[PDB]
Each structure stands twice: as structure tokens, then as C-alpha cells.
Ligand binder design. Structure first.
Ligand code: GGQ
Ligand code: GGQ
Length: 105
């Protein structure tokens, strides 16, 4: 399971999930709601997947955790227009994540 040295990542993820702009990213992009997503996005990522991976020990290092966070935001900018509701949310969340990360790095 998660090593205690990564508790700071667990907290960052909790804070991200609580953010007002996090709603698009809480769970995997849902084919019931969105068509053609995995046709374009070859490595989907979302905060629930990250939360489970972190807790089970699937991130050995904070860098691996951060790479999945950035993948959420990179996928969002690949698929969504910048002025769409989800596109705007991705930009908010990237800034929020980078600000929390920069306290440590
Ligand atoms: C906040 C916002 O601006 C939204 C936009 C542009 N679209 C949707 C949307 C599309 S489908 C959908 N849901 C509603 C709940 N049950 C299943 C289908 N909601 C939202 C709702 C945000 C949510 F609360 F769900 F996180
Ligand atoms: C294509 C994409 O990247 C998306 C991500 C990462 N999230 C959502 C989304 C929309 S509604 C939604 N949830 C929020 C939680 N309650 C249930 C409904 N999630 C989309 C689809 C955006 C749409 F095409 F619908 F405008």
C-alpha cells in the first residue's frame, strides 16, 4: 500500500477532488455521456483512478503521481476546446495542481 512518504500527494489529490473545477475529472470519462473519447485519448486518467492507484501502492514516487495528474489535464486539452466548460475546468485544475506542487518542488 501507499508509503507514508507520499501522504502529501494523497492530500493534494483530496484537495483537487474537492475543488469547484474538479467535477469533469472525478471519474473516468464516461461513454454513456461522451462519444469518441478513447478513439482519440489513448491514456485516459481521472482522479478516482489516481486515488486508488496511490492508496494501493501503484505510485512508487511522487513523480509518477504528478505525471498522472498532468495526464488528466493534457487529455482535457487534447479533447476539449479551450472555451468549453470542461476545457476551462482543466486549465483551472492544472494551475491549482501546479501551485500545490510548487510548495514542495
Ligand atoms: C456544471 C456544468 O457546467 C455541467 C455541464 C456543462 N454539463 C454537465 C453535465 C453533462 S451530463 C451531466 N450529468 C448530470 C448528473 N448525472 C448524469 C448526467 N452533467 C454539468 C453537470 C456537472 C455535474 F454536476 F454533473 F458534475
Ligand atoms: C470529453 C471530456 O473530456 C469530459 C470529461 C473529462 N468529463 C466530462 C463530463 C461531462 S459531464 C460529466 N459528469 C460529471 C460528474 N457527474 C456526472 C457527469 N463529465 C466530459 C464530457 C464533456 C462533454 F462532452 F459532455 F461536454
Amino acid at each position: 500500500s501507499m508509503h507514508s512518504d507520499l501522504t502529501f500527494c494523497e492530500i493534494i489529490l483530496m484537495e483537487m477532488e474537492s475543488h469547484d473545477a474538479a467535477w469533469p475529472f472525478l471519474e473516468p470519462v464516461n461513454p454513456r455521456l461522451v462519444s469518441g473519447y478513447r478513439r482519440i485519448i489513448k491514456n485516459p486518467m481521472d482522479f478516482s483512478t489516481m486515488r486508488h492507484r496511490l492508496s494501493r501502492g501503484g505510485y512508487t514516487s511522487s513523480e509518477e503521481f504528478a505525471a498522472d495528474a498532468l495526464l488528466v489535464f493534457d487529455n482535457c486539452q487534447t479533447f476539449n476546446e479551450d472555451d468549453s466548460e470542461v476545457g476551462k475546468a482543466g486549465h483551472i485544475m492544472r494551475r491549482f495542481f501546479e501551485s500545490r506542487w510548487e510548495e514542495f518542488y
